[PDB]
């Protein structure tokens, strides 16, 4: 009673990959036969069904329109044609086979991992804000920090003000420069790795969430944010 | 099989006067586990002093119990009328319950 | 906190006869009870001891084999079923809380006679 | 069915004083009178109690001690004698009937106010959450301007006394390792640890000494 | 440079307790020695202030009166009497030099935990309500454990005026009170209800339970 | 039903106190009293016991013989007397009615500090020695590591060797000097508050725990050792 | 250049000893000396030091008040009076000749045992809980664990909550005993040596440090805690 699982691997986003999944030791053509994925550092997670047929092949919908599963019955063989993938579906794809209330999955293939990416060996620049939350009342001086994981070039950092259910506008550039018809309260600074941005007597009206982003290469990256409350 | 043997038999004894009650045992009592009751005619048997030492609660300050091993005393420092009954010793430090044979207090 | 006994009298030897004690103010589930008879004129004399699931019951060898005591926590209710009785059987019987360490026999029932002749 | 309260004022701590309750409408000889206080925007708190001879006399712990509570029943008043006061028993305390299931406090008295008598400082945030190698910005602002900036930091690490940090608003203790820096003049100052360490998780607190009530900030926490 | 601080303990209300704190290490004689305590769970609060003598002496409110502070230059000791002790002088007291521009509180010693001490709690929802006239205001006081006889009360308090009975004996409506308020429940859950709003009902509702010898006010419901 | 209880404080080493604990609502003179304590952030821990008259006062292993347990049942009041007190007598003590069967600890008292110690603490340098355990083979090289929490003046800082049932045997002092027969593998360097200790290839000898110890004031200090398998 | 020691042993707690250190080869009365010891299996720790003419002895704060350093230059010997033993002096004792910018501790005695106990090897009932910790939210249930080394007789096994900075409370005895006022989501189960505490749906009033109790012997002993956040 085996799941042999074959493909995967490396591959440019938008490409194609097949996977299989080869059984033996039970009646394969009876049997409804499931993929499960699996991102890396994270939870199971349930990807498309196939059964008899006379019924309904199932996706989930992170992969409806794109991934075709199938089955070929006089091979013992279950396929999954992955279609115009994105960076989303990198995760390890395991073949399960789908016993419902005489097993739930009580077979699984070992496993494959896809990786969908373009870049190279290197990271982006990773842009780590702190504190995630800052609780403040008016008048009060808000300090928060940005620190990069690699120097940012020409100190090519900005902040950015986000209220609930609005665009995010833009404070300061080039690390210190405010924006245009942004108060003076507002200051940033710091060069390299460590930049600061400063609020020197909060205001009501600045409640909200600040993103730092670093624009000194071909890869934008943003900070999480930092959430002043 | 632990004997407990109450002394003397019968008390002759007036309102004030003092009441001193012994009971031995043929073996050491473990733990002091040794109790003392008050029957009076017709009605059931009533706690004065168990572990030897200690009085029941509300039980008037004038009966006190002392002793260890296999020598123990009761006392009633001044008798009153409500006193004079038949007194029971009664040792609990094993599976064989055992009893005194009495001493009536008249 | 009190014990409400039931049953005896007057019954033939080799009769039976069941002995009820019902209890009140305290956590009978959890303690300790047994039987004390007294025969007219005599002195106390423990018969039987009845403790928690997982103990053993124990019986004076005057009665082994022919007594039973058992309990209904339920009704927070202890029972001697007294069998193939004999003239030596007869005497006032007392149920009674044990508390050991903590009282000995704290707490009586008012006991009832039990009779045994013909 | 009345009852008419006396007594109260302004007195100095440790001082004395005495309160009066002087009943009419029902048979107070039989009544157990109780006193019951309210701090000065607080909820109702029960004092004392009092009630027939053969009957103990109550109190609460805040007040055991140092107030006595009495009875004439041939005057037909309630008394209360308070003694060594001091400024946490400040309130309004009031008499009141006590009827149990026939009332509770069915009656009570108009109650009569006892009272018993600088720079503020304020810290922001009041928490922090942060990990190790992040900055830490802690901030106190004074209510009026900090003479000569004579405002300083400790560190408080739970179980152990306060720890001396930065005094003269910048000036950084023997010992203290240079990632503590402190800054600002006249009403706000700022204490800003550069990368924190595990063992910086801790309260800190500000503390101004140019006069002649110091006074301390209510602590921040960091962890 | 040390404070060896002793004493303290826990005492009963209005008992006597003695502190001392023994310095070595600098010139005792000169320095500026304060007394600081901290509540638990609380901040640090200056007690009292001693100097060289030139003694004016320095005092709390708190401890006005009933503290006093004291120096033996020839033992290097200080020393903090507290006499007519309540319960909100529960607190760690911490001996220190005081130096000012110099250092301020730079020496500590380790302080003392002298604790004045020895129920059921009610707890009221919501803490606030906000609501117009007609409407529907519904009261709950939850107990942290049963009250036996359902002894519980409930009390309305307009600002500046004495507490008003409403409903004892978790039912019972008080002498002239209006039928649209109600009071229900049983063991450790009441409450009272004020059916249709009066602009002279917005006040401040207080539950109470007298079934017991330690009699205890829930913390209040302010209706606006 | 209540216990009331008073006194505690803070001592010196060796000193002595009693604590008292005063019984209402219940007959004290019929009941097992105990005391029980409690460290700073510890667990609960039982101390002693006592009960009616015919009966053994009981104590735990650490305070027989310095403890003493006792009551006076015509105040019905339990009493703790404490001699030669160290700092691990520090706790919160509780008085305690023991009802066993019926309660166990069924009341408590509300607890007092006992506080022990003798003034610290404190202006110690704390030395900190990195790694704890470094595994090698003969041949290999050691380094060991000892950070001090304050400059350590005129680098006064030694090295010892200890291996297990002897004496800690000097290899380092001053920081760098070799003491008289050791071989020169051996060898310290650091200043300030950064020592090192280097092993420059191990000997089957060499095995063996390791201590920094530095003595520039009138309060010594060790680290608490390296262990070299 | 020799330090001769002699003394130590076992001794009972509260109880007294006397060290000696007889030196051979210097100058004794020109050095200082030391006391170090090192409980077993820990470190090596300073305990008092001596030196010339003007007696300026040093203690550490352990020991301080309970031990007395003393010195006989015409005899050249060392001493160290140490009274008030607890549990936590057993350590081997070291006497050393303290050369400073010279030498350090060059010259060691080589050790004596000084154990202090009362006969402590433990017969005692161990109770085991786990999870230390359990983060849950408020509706989920708590289920706690208690494990004895032995079986528990009669199942006198107790429950405890303490909040902090308050007396524990009795929750549950007998194993399975609810105690008078406490809410019926609390309850206890289990036999022998495997115990269980269960709080149905939590509630914020809740969140404590739960303990269990055996007392079905002589030597009570208590669960280390679990702590619900």
């Known amino acids: 009673v085996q799941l042999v699982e074959s493909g995967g691997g490396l591959v440019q986003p938008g490409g194609s990959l097949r996977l299989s999944c080869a059984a033996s030791?039970?009646?394969?053509?009876?049997?409804?036969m499931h993929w499960v994925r699996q991102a890396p550092g994270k939870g199971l997670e349930w990807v498309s069904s196939?059964?008899?047929?006379?019924?309904?092949?199932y996706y989930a919908d992170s992969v409806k329109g794109r991934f075709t599963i199938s089955r070929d019955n006089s091979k013992n063989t279950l396929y999954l044609q992955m279609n115009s993938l994105t960076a989303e579906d990198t995760a390890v794809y395991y073949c399960?086979?789908?016993?419902?209330?005489?097993?739930?999955?009580?077979?699984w293939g070992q496993g494959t991992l896809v990786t969908v990416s373009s870049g190279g060996g290197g990271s982006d620049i990773v842009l780590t804000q702190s504190p995630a939350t800052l609780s403040l009342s008016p008048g009060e001086r808000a300090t928060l920090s940005c620190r990069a994981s690699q120097s940012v070039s020409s100190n090519y950092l900005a902040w950015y003000q986000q209220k609930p259910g609005q665009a995010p506008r833009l404070l300061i550039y080039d690390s210190s420069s405010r924006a245009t018809g942004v108060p003076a309260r507002f200051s940033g600074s710091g060069s390299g790795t460590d930049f600061t941005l400063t609020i020197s007597s909060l205001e009501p009206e600045d409640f909200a969430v600040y993103y730092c982003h670093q624009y000194s290469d071909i890869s934008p990256t943003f900070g999480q944010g930092t959430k002043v409350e | 099989d632990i004997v407990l043997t109450q002394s003397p038999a019968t008390l002759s004894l007036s309102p004030g006067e003092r009441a001193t009650l012994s009971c031995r045992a043929s073996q050491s009592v473990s733990s002091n586990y040794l109790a003392w009751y008050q029957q009076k005619p017709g009605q059931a048997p009533r706690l004065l002093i168990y572990d030897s030492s200690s009085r029941a609660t509300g039980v008037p300050a004038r009966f006190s119990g002392s002793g260890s091993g296999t020598d123990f005393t009761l006392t009633i420092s001044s008798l009153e009328p409500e006193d004079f009954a038949v007194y029971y010793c009664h040792q609990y430090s094993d599976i064989s319950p055992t009893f005194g044979q009495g001493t009536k207090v008249e | 906190v009190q014990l409400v006994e039931s049953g005896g009298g007057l019954v033939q030897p080799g009769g039976s006869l069941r002995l009820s004690c019902?209890?009140?103010?305290?956590?009978?589930?959890?303690?300790?009870?047994?039987?004390v008879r007294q025969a007219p004129g005599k002195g106390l004399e423990w018969?039987?001891?009845?403790?928690?699931?997982?103990?053993?019951?124990?019986?004076?060898d005057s009665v082994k084999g022919r007594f039973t005591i058992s309990r209904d926590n339920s009704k927070n209710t202890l029972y001697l079923q007294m069998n193939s009785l004999t003239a030596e059987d007869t005497a006032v019987?007392?149920?009674?809380?044990?508390?050991?360490?903590?009282?000995?026999?704290?707490?009586?029932?008012?006991g009832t006679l039990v009779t045994v002749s013909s | 069915v009345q009852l008419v309260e006396s007594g109260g004022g302004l007195v100095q701590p440790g001082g004395s004083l005495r309160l009066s309750c002087?009943?009419?409408?029902?048979?107070?000889?039989?009544?157990?009178?109780?006193?019951v206080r309210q701090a000065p925007g607080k909820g109702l708190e029960w004092?004392?109690?009092?009630?027939?001879?053969?009957?103990?006399?109550?109190?609460?712990d805040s007040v055991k001690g140092r107030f006595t509570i009495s009875r004439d029943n041939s005057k037909n008043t309630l008394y209360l004698q308070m003694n060594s006061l001091t400024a946490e028993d400040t309130a309004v305390?009031?008499?009141?009937?006590?009827?149990?299931?026939?009332?509770?406090?069915?009656?009570?008295?108009?109650g009569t106010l006892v009272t018993v008598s600088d720079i503020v400082l304020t810290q922001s945030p009041a928490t922090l959450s942060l990990s190790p190698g992040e900055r830490a910005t802690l901030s106190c602002r004074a209510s009026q301007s900090v003479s000569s900036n004579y405002l300083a930091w400790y560190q408080q690490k739970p179980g152990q006394a306060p720890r001396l940090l930065i005094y003269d608003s910048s000036s950084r203790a023997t010992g203290v390792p240079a990632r503590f820096s402190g800054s600002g003049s006249g009403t706000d100052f700022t204490l800003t640890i550069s990368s924190l360490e595990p063992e910086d998780f801790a309260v800190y607190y500000c503390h101004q000494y140019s006069d002649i009530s110091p006074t301390f900030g209510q602590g921040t926490k960091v962890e | 440079v040390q404070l060896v601080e002793s004493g303290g303990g826990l005492v009963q209300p209005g008992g006597s307790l003695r502190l001392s704190c023994?310095?070595?290490?600098?010139?005792?004689?000169?320095?500026?020695?304060?007394?600081v305590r901290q509540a638990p769970g609380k901040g640090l609060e200056w007690?009292?202030?001693?100097?060289?003598?030139?003694?004016?002496?320095?005092?709390?409110d708190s401890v006005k009166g009933r503290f006093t502070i004291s120096r033996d230059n020839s033992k290097n000791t200080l020393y903090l009497q507290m006499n007519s002790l309540t319960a909100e002088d529960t607190a760690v007291?911490?001996?220190?030099?005081?130096?000012?521009?110099?250092?301020?509180?730079?020496?500590?010693?380790?302080g003392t935990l002298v604790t004045v001490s020895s129920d059921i709690v009610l707890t009221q929802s919501p803490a606030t309500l906000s609501l117009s006239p007609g409407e529907r205001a519904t009261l709950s006081c939850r107990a942290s454990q049963s009250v036996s006889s359902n002894y519980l009360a409930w009390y309305q308090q307009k600002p500046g005026q004495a507490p008003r009975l409403l409903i004892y004996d978790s039912s019972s409506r008080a002498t002239g009170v209006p039928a649209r308020f109600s009071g229900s429940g049983s063991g450790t859950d009441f409450t009272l209800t004020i059916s249709s709003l009066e602009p002279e009902d917005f006040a401040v509702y207080y539950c109470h339970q007298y079934s017991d010898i330690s009699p205890t006010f829930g913390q209040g419901t302010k209706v606006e | 039903v209540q216990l009331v209880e008073s006194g505690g404080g803070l001592v010196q080493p060796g000193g002595s106190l009693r604590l008292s604990c005063?019984?209402?609502?219940?007959?004290?003179?019929?009941?097992?009293?105990?005391?029980v304590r409690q460290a700073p952030g510890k667990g609960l821990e039982w101390?002693?016991?006592?009960?009616?008259?015919?009966?053994?006062?009981?104590?735990?292993d650490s305070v027989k013989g310095r403890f003493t347990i006792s009551r006076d049942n015509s105040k019905n009041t339990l009493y703790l007397q404490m001699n030669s007190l160290t700092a691990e007598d520090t706790a919160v003590?509780?008085?305690?009615?023991?009802?066993?069967?019926?309660?166990?600890?069924?009341?408590?008292?509300?607890g007092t500090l006992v506080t022990v110690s003798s003034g610290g603490g404190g202006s110690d340098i704390v030395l900190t020695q990195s790694p704890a355990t470094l595994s090698l083979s003969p041949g290999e090289r050691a380094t060991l590591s000892c950070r001090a929490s304050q400059s350590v003046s005129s680098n006064y800082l030694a090295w010892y060797q200890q291996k297990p049932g002897q004496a800690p045997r000097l290899l380092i002092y001053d920081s760098s000097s070799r003491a008289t027969g050791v071989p020169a593998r051996f060898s310290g360097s650091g200043s300030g508050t950064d020592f090192t200790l280097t092993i420059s290839s191990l000997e089957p000898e060499d095995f063996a725990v390791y201590y920094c110890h530095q003595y520039s004031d009138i309060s010594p200090t060790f680290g608490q050792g390296t262990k070299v398998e | 250049v020799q330090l001769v020691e002699s003394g130590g042993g076992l001794v009972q707690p509260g109880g007294s000893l006397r060290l000696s250190c007889?030196?051979?080869?210097?100058?004794?009365?020109?050095?200082?000396?030391?006391?170090v010891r090192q409980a077993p299996g820990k470190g090596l720790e300073w305990?008092?030091?001596?030196?010339?003419?003007?007696?300026?002895?040093?203690?550490?704060d352990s020991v301080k008040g309970r031990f007395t350093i003393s010195r006989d230059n015409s005899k050249n010997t060392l001493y160290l009076q140490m009274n008030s033993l607890t549990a936590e002096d057993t350590a081997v004792?070291?006497?050393?000749?303290?050369?400073?910018?010279?030498?350090?501790?060059?010259?060691?005695?080589?050790g004596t045992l000084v154990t202090v106990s009362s006969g402590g090897g433990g017969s005692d009932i161990v109770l085991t809980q786990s999870p230390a910790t359990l983060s849950l939210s408020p509706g989920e249930r708590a289920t706690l664990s208690c494990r004895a080394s032995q079986s528990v007789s009669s199942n006198y096994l107790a429950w405890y909550q303490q909040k902090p900075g308050q007396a524990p409370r009795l929750l549950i005895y007998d194993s399975s005993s609810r105690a008078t006022g406490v809410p019926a989501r609390f309850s206890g189960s289990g036999s022998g040596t495997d115990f269980t505490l269960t709080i149905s749906s939590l509630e914020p009033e809740d969140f404590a440090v739960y303990y269990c109790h055996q007392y079905s012997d002589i030597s009570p002993t208590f669960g280390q805690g679990t702590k619900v956040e």
């Open positions: 399960a086979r789908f016993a419902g209330g005489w097993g739930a999955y009580d077979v």
């Open positions: 030791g039970f009646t394969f053509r009876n049997s409804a």
């Open positions: 196939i059964w008899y047929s006379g019924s309904n092949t």
